[PDB]
């Protein structure tokens, strides 16, 4: 997260950190039930040198605040039993960039570990709405990740504006969120983490960090997978 601030302990208890064997934190995720996380499909694509698609090579840290303190009170470490990438995920365009991660054993909810509510398929996050992004990603493009979880408030961008700022790169599964003046944005290492819409005292997951053109640049807001459209797919594949 560029242009954010340190989160409070326990403030985003649905935020999860996914570490790949021998590499540390790679992507975020969100807790949606005791057994399931939402993340981004593109985090689980192989390269030469590492099979990011292999569920056995990932460790999820729930209840984490500081990457240098992974054995702190309240952290729950879990292996993954499987990764369900969306059937229509396209790794050349990032359309349908969403995956469901099954924990090997359930999380226990606590003051530091709690699920985020899913939006139903009719839920709308209208252009202009202020929502939050969180993660341990880089705090500048080309920089290094944050040890302490970062948060930043950003605004939903109109879909036609989004399409035009990033021409031939935006599909209906995507949403731009940020500021047209840049400054606050997600960045590398925030991928797969949640947008949190705080809106009464209810909080809904709005989307999933996916990609962007650099980070925090003007007229280049971050791009996120929309979540309401996937409610039934989540239900069918996880029961959640």
């Amino acid at each position: 997260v560029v242009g954010g601030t340190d989160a409070d302990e326990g403030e985003w208890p649905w935020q999860v950190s996914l570490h790949a064997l021998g590499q540390g934190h790679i992507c975020g995720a969100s807790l949606i039930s005791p057994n399931w996380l939402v993340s981004a499909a593109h985090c689980y694509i192989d390269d030469r040198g590492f099979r990011y698609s292999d569920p056995t090579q990932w460790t999820a840290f729930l209840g984490l605040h500081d990457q240098s303190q992974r054995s702190a009170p309240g952290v729950q470490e879990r292996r993954l039993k499987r990764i369900i990438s969306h059937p229509f995920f396209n790794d050349f365009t990032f359309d349908y960039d969403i995956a469901l991660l099954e924990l090997e054993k359930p999380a226990e909810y606590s003051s530091m570990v709690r699920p985020i509510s899913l939006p139903d398929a009719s839920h709308v996050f209208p252009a202009g709405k202020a929502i939050w992004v969180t993660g341990w990603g880089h705090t500048q493009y080309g920089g290094t990740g944050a040890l302490i979880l970062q948060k930043g408030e950003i605004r939903v961008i109109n879909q036609t504006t989004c399409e035009n700022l990033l021409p031939q790169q935006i599909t209906p599964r995507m949403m731009c969120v940020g500021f047209l003046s840049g400054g606050v944005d997600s960045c590398q290492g925030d991928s797969g983490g949640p947008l949190s819409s705080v809106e009464d005292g209810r909080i809904f997951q709005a989307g999933v960090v996916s990609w962007g053109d650099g980070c925090a640049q003007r007229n280049k807001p971050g791009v996120y997978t929309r979540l309401p459209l996937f409610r039934d797919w989540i239900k069918e594949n996880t029961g959640v």
Partner: peptide, 4 residues
């Protein structure tokens, strides 16, 4: 187009 080349997102990978």
């Amino acid at each position: 187009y080349x997102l990978r």
